[PDB]
Amino acid sequence: RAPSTSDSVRLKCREMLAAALRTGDDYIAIGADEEELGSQIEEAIYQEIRNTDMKYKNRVRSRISNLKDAKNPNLRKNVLCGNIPPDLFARMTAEEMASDELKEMRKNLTKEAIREHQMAKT
Amino acid sequence: NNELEPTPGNTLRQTFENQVNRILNDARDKTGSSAQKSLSEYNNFKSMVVSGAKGSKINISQVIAVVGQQNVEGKRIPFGFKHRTLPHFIKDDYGP
Amino acid sequence: GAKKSAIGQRIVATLPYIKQEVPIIIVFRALGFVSDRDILEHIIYDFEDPEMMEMVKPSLDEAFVIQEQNVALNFIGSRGAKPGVTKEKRIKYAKEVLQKEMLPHVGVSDFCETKKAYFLGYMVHRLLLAALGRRELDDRDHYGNKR
Amino acid sequence: VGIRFCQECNNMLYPKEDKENRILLYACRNCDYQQEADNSCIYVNKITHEVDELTQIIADVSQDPTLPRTEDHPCQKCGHKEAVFFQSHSARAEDAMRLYYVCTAPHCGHRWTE
Amino acid sequence: KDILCRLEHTTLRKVTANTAIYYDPNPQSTVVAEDQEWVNVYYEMPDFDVARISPWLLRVELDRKHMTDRKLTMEQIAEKINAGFGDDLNCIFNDD
Amino acid sequence: QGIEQISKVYMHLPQTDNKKKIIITEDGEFKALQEWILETDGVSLMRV
Amino acid sequence: PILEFLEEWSMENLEEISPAAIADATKIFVNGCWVGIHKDPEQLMNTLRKLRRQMDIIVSEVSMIRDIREREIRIYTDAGRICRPLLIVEKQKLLLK
Ligand SMILES: [Zn+2]
Ligand SMILES: [Zn+2]
């Protein structure tokens, strides 16, 4: 259910998203149309941004980097399997939830550590 | 051993000297309190201080028990020499 | 604001009987040292410590215009407190000032030039060790600095 | 770091971009001597203490009478027990509470920190 | 503290570890190989770097803990730079 | 970010009762709440 | 007499050295005037202390300060310095008998 577009930048974004989804052959393991998924994601991002400006581009690049990395494979597995719906995946809030579990563990660890780092008044 | 963690809004040196300062302050206060509890009913320092006519409790604790920490500009005595307060101490000595 | 931060900090010298500071490397050139390696040898005694080397780049680039001792002497005599009537007299006046007025206790003979240069380099070296925080600033009330 | 001097006048070689082949050349102005740059980093500065105190301590402080001496941390290159320990007490650290140890024996200027 | 970060004047120098000027003339290659992998992401969709870019390079390392403590993101730093210098500085940032 | 002419701001809870937030309860009593206050070292009052 | 004695010993005048060695030798000043460099400060300091304590060439009140950390040996013979006597200690024992 991806509306096609003739814009060169948009279709280029879509095919690089597909070239991120090919990584690890998880799409072979699942059997989901990675091109259609990438087109859906790029449509959702363009609906959110309404533009091809810096926010659009760096959002697409942040998502493609978060997909390509091998230290968070279960994220890609959940995206391709359909556990994570595409519209939600378009609007993840950076690394705060869209990230591997160990990263969230250490982020919460340093979140608790910055408590003792910055209370005082003695 | 680098296992003192600084308090926030304070660097490691500041946290260290604050710990030492509070330790010596409570030591002085405890010694002065114990000295005051030892005073007889006829001790005339206690007479003059209870009347409030002269002196104070800190004077009694200083004369009887411990003069306490000497401070300059609100700080302990700095290293006027190279890392030393006097030529009678090893360098880098933060003892009382 | 436009260029002062790119060059950053740079070192000057305020010699006696001169109404204006001078860049230090100009003073070294006035003592007959054109090679920058020679000047830095008198200042930096170990060329393998890159921090000290980056410290002196702004002064060197400040004084890159002048490459001749006589040009530096003309520079100094132009900035002298008693301006000479011409380039030759300005050069002679700056030469006499360096001969006698600056660091006299090192020496007042011509052949002491190298000694004075070494001492001046050491002063700059000390300043760099004050700049990099490897030495502690001397205290005006330290009674050992008194007579 | 880019400290290289001219081989003709012994003056600082400034960086220069060769657009004809897109390579850095360290060139001497006023003596037109070029040198093939290979660092590919004309200038780098440090903001958060990329310097270490053990590089800077001098072995001759083993002879200092005013420094304290401990025998609880032997040397690691001769096993000599006595070591002179002290604080750097310099800038670029701002907490000199840690200790740097020097093996007190002569001819072994081995150092370490705890 | 989240409001406190909106008050305390955070300059760039607070949140950076070190800075280097490289040449790196061909941009699709990198003098630092670890830079290459993520730089090729931004050169898969190059903008204002179609086949050329100014042949110098200013690489700066940004302190992770100061970014988290001040709750700064890469995007706002890049936007601040591009606003302060228009198009004159193309800034390419690694993923956070 | 942050407003200019400001340095490190001290966040704390005032143990002194004067800086605590005094409110009138439903019973008409003065309750002093312990609340977070920020003490800066510079000044730009209109901006903050 | 200080300068004569130091010249008689292995001290190298600044006019007669390569700068490269200056990093690995202790700089020797006399009344603040940099005289030279020396390759072994411990031996030289012990020698000067012995001479002053014997009062052979060096008269007393001549101060010999070695900054070990900075590799400097400052010798002072000018007037105006303030000094006091102190008993010499050796091997944690007094020389006074
Ligand atoms: Zn040249
Ligand atoms: Zn050893």
Curated annotation (Swiss-Prot), chain A:
Domain TFIIS central per the UniProt entry, residue ranges: 9-122
Coarse class of the protein's main subcellular location: nucleus
Cellular component annotations (GO), alphabetically ordered: nucleolus; nucleoplasm; nucleus; transcription factor TFIID complex
GO molecular function per UniProt: DNA binding; zinc ion binding
Keywords, comma-separated and alphabetical: Acetylation, Chromosomal rearrangement, DNA-binding, Isopeptide bond, Metal-binding, Nucleus, Phosphoprotein, Transcription, Transcription regulation, Ubl conjugation, Zinc, Zinc-finger
Biological-process GO terms, alphabetical: erythrocyte differentiation; positive regulation of transcription by RNA polymerase II; transcription by RNA polymerase II; transcription elongation by RNA polymerase II
Cellular location(s): Nucleus
Record-annotated disulphide pairs: none
Subunit organization: Interacts with EAF2. Associates with UBR5 and forms a transcription regulatory complex made of CDK9, Pol II, UBR5 and TCEA1/TFIIS. Part of TBP-based Pol II pre-initiation complex (PIC), in which Pol II core assembles with general transcription factors and other specific initiation factors including GTF2E1, GTF2E2, GTF2F1, GTF2F2, TCEA1, ERCC2, ERCC3, GTF2H2, GTF2H3, GTF2H4, GTF2H5, GTF2A1, GTF2A2, GTF2B and TBP; this large multi-subunit PIC complex mediates DNA unwinding and targets Pol II core to the transcription start site where the first phosphodiester bond forms.
Record: disease: A chromosomal aberration involving TCEA1 may be a cause of salivary gland pleiomorphic adenomas (PA) [181030]. Pleiomorphic adenomas are the most common benign epithelial tumors of the salivary gland. Translocation t(3;8)(p21;q12) with PLAG1.
Family: Belongs to the TFS-II family.
Note: S-II binds to RNA-polymerase II in the absence of transcription.
Function: Necessary for efficient RNA polymerase II transcription elongation past template-encoded arresting sites. The arresting sites in DNA have the property of trapping a certain fraction of elongating RNA polymerases that pass through, resulting in locked ternary complexes. Cleavage of the nascent transcript by S-II allows the resumption of elongation from the new 3'-terminus.
Protein's name according to its UniProt entry: Transcription elongation factor A protein 1
Residues of the full protein shown: 132 to 253 of 301
Curated annotation (Swiss-Prot), chain D:
Lineage top rank: taxon: Eukaryota
Function: DNA-dependent RNA polymerase catalyzes the transcription of DNA into RNA using the four ribonucleoside triphosphates as substrates. Component of RNA polymerase II which synthesizes mRNA precursors and many functional non-coding RNAs. Pol II is the central component of the basal RNA polymerase II transcription machinery. It is composed of mobile elements that move relative to each other. RPB9 is part of the upper jaw surrounding the central large cleft and thought to grab the incoming DNA template.
SUPFAM superfamilies, A to Z: Zinc beta-ribbon
Protein name: DNA-directed RNA polymerase II subunit RPB9
GO biological process, one term: transcription-coupled nucleotide-excision repair
CDD domains from the UniProt entry: Zn-ribbon_RPB9
Keyword Nucleus attached: yes
InterPro entries attached to this UniProt entry: DNA-dir_RNA_pol-M_15_CS, Rpa12/Rpb9/Rpc10/TFS, Zn_ribbon_RPB9, Zn_ribbon_RPB9_C, Znf_TFIIS
Annotated signal peptide: none
Subcellular location: Nucleus, Nucleolus
Keyword Transcription: yes
GO cellular component, one term: nucleus
Keywords: Acetylation, DNA-directed RNA polymerase, Metal-binding, Nucleus, Transcription, Zinc, Zinc-finger
Species assigned in the record: Sus scrofa
Zinc finger (C4-type): 6-31
Binding site for Zn(2+) 2: 75, 78, 103, 108
